[PDB]
Amino acid sequence: GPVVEKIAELGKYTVGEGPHWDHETQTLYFVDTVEKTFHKYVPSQKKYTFCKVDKLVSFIIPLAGSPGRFVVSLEREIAILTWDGVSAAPTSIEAIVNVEPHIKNNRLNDGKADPLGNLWTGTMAIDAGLPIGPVTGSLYHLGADKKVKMHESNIAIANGLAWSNDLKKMYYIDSGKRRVDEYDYDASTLSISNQRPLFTFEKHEVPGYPDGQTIDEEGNLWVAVFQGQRIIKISTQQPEVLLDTVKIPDPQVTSVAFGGPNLDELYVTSAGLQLDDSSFDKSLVNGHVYRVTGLGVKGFAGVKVKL
Ligand SMILES: [Hg+2]
Ligand SMILES: [Hg+2]
Ligand SMILES: [Mg+2]
């Protein structure tokens, strides 16, 4: 079976999240969604750094064409952070847009560029809760002239995103729905339609909640299962097909990104935050970062945001 390695050099995260693999610099970036910190890992040189801000963060993606600059979330603002990748604070911050200026208790959560470089991201209540809590989020993309467009409402916990290789489908996760949805994606108008369930956890006895996801070159989705102690591999060719399960030692698996020189090493983030209604005792909940090899598939390099 696949090899699952705990990355000792990286330590433990409260809620490690938002992994992004920059293929040209062979570097993994990620966030902690509770501790207000950004993180950088260079595996070939065993180099780790972090950056502190005073707002809640949920994604970090290199800005296309601008070395040393990243598109990030700061609470409800999408911003450009100028960061040298090693100092413990940003050099400067350039706000782009506040997606929800008048919803004081919301935050941005998962975000990712589509294959064309358009940032997609969604919101949630800061005090969202599972299985039931306030449902206040929406799904957006950042379009022309730095204005966002809304694509879906009634989202409890805005989470993982992926697009098919032929640009005809988008896949999206609201963790509260305990399923992965598929949509027809119109690359020319950047709109989505015909929402329907692709994979429903209760139909396959999968515990926990879908969180982050990524897609491989064959079109399979790799889905992080929060409170499931696993990643799952699901089909996009047929609905409701579980292809494989890989157990991860940490119960609170949060997200996934393919990396390594050949894009065939799956980086997996997790959360050490101990929750009062957990299916797992506190001794099990650590928050390590893992690397999975031997899956027999390749992914894609992380896409930079175009502004
Ligand atoms: Hg930073
Ligand atoms: Hg940053
Ligand atoms: Mg997430």
Side-chain angles (χ1 to χ4, degrees):
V3 172
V4 178
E5 174 184 5
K6 179 185 299 175
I7 303 174
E9 297 81 346
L10 280 178
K12 292 179 285 193
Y13 297 84
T14 303
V15 186
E17 262 283 14
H20 175 101
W21 177 258
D22 182 74
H23 199 49
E24 285 296 306
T25 66
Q26 294 286 292
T27 294
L28 186 75
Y29 298 96
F30 61 102
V31 309
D32 189 299
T33 55
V34 169
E35 301 292 359
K36 305 183 174 185
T37 52
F38 301 99
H39 306 270
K40 181 196 80 185
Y41 172 56
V42 183
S44 61
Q45 295 190 271
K46 298 185 186 307
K47 286 195 308 193
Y48 165 72
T49 67
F50 65 91
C51 174
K52 296 171 306 184
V53 294
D54 69 5
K55 299 290 186 59
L56 295 168
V57 303
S58 62
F59 58 80
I60 173 166
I61 308 164
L63 177 60
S66 287
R69 305 188 84 198
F70 303 83
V71 184
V72 304
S73 51
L74 300 170
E75 202 172 274
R76 292 173 308 277
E77 286 192 314
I78 302 167
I80 304 172
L81 256 53
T82 301
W83 181 42
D84 60 12
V86 54
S87 301
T91 299
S92 62
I93 298 182
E94 177 181 347
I96 297 308
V97 63
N98 188 317
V99 301
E100 291 173 350
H102 300 282
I103 308 178
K104 66 182 185 314
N105 207 35
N106 267 21
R107 60 171 298 173
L108 286 157
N109 198 23
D110 212 357
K112 187 183 286 182
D114 70 18
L116 301 176
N118 307 293
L119 174 68
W120 291 67
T121 182
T123 54
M124 64 184 278
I126 293 170
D127 59 333
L130 295 168
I132 299 187
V135 182
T136 63
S138 300
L139 172 62
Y140 303 95
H141 89 267
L142 177 62
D145 296 329
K146 313 213 221 73
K147 63 205 172 160
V148 298
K149 313 291 171 187
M150 188 185 292
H151 297 277
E152 187 166 334
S153 57
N154 301 132
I155 288 166
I157 296 180
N159 251 321
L161 317 90
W163 294 264
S164 64
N165 187 58
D166 63 8
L167 296 195
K168 295 186 177 168
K169 307 296 291 171
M170 180 176 174
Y171 308 101
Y172 190 68
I173 291 162
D174 169 5
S175 295
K177 300 181 173 81
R178 302 197 72 247
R179 69 184 200 235
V180 181
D181 281 340
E182 62 172 350
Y183 309 70
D184 289 332
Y185 170 86
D186 185 334
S188 67
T189 63
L190 302 179
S191 60
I192 54 176
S193 68
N194 291 327
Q195 172 176 14
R196 58 214 188 271
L198 176 65
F199 185 91
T200 308
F201 274 31
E202 62 183 12
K203 293 181 191 293
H204 308 267
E205 271 197 282
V206 177
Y209 302 88
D211 198 333
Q213 65 178 338
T214 191
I215 197 168
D216 66 32
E217 274 194 346
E218 297 179 349
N220 314 303
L221 291 168
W222 294 84
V223 181
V225 185
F226 189 94
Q227 286 270 322
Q229 209 185 19
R230 74 194 67 199
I231 58 175
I232 55 173
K233 180 194 189 177
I234 64 174
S235 179
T236 63
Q237 297 179 21
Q238 319 172 232
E240 305 291 353
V241 175
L242 176 61
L243 294 174
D244 199 13
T245 300
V246 181
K247 177 176 237 174
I248 308 293
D250 256 286
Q252 296 183 154
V253 182
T254 58
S255 200
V256 281
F258 282 97
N262 299 137
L263 294 171
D264 56 3
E265 308 179 8
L266 187 62
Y267 284 91
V268 181
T269 51
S270 74
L273 180 62
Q274 279 152 194
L275 304 166
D276 288 338
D277 45 351
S278 174
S279 295
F280 300 82
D281 264 16
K282 301 170 186 305
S283 65
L284 300 168
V285 173
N286 294 314
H288 291 288
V289 181
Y290 301 83
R291 181 163 54 213
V292 186
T293 56
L295 298 171
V297 298
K298 270 170 51 86
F300 302 92
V303 179
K304 298 197 180 182
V305 172
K306 287 190 182 190
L307 299 179

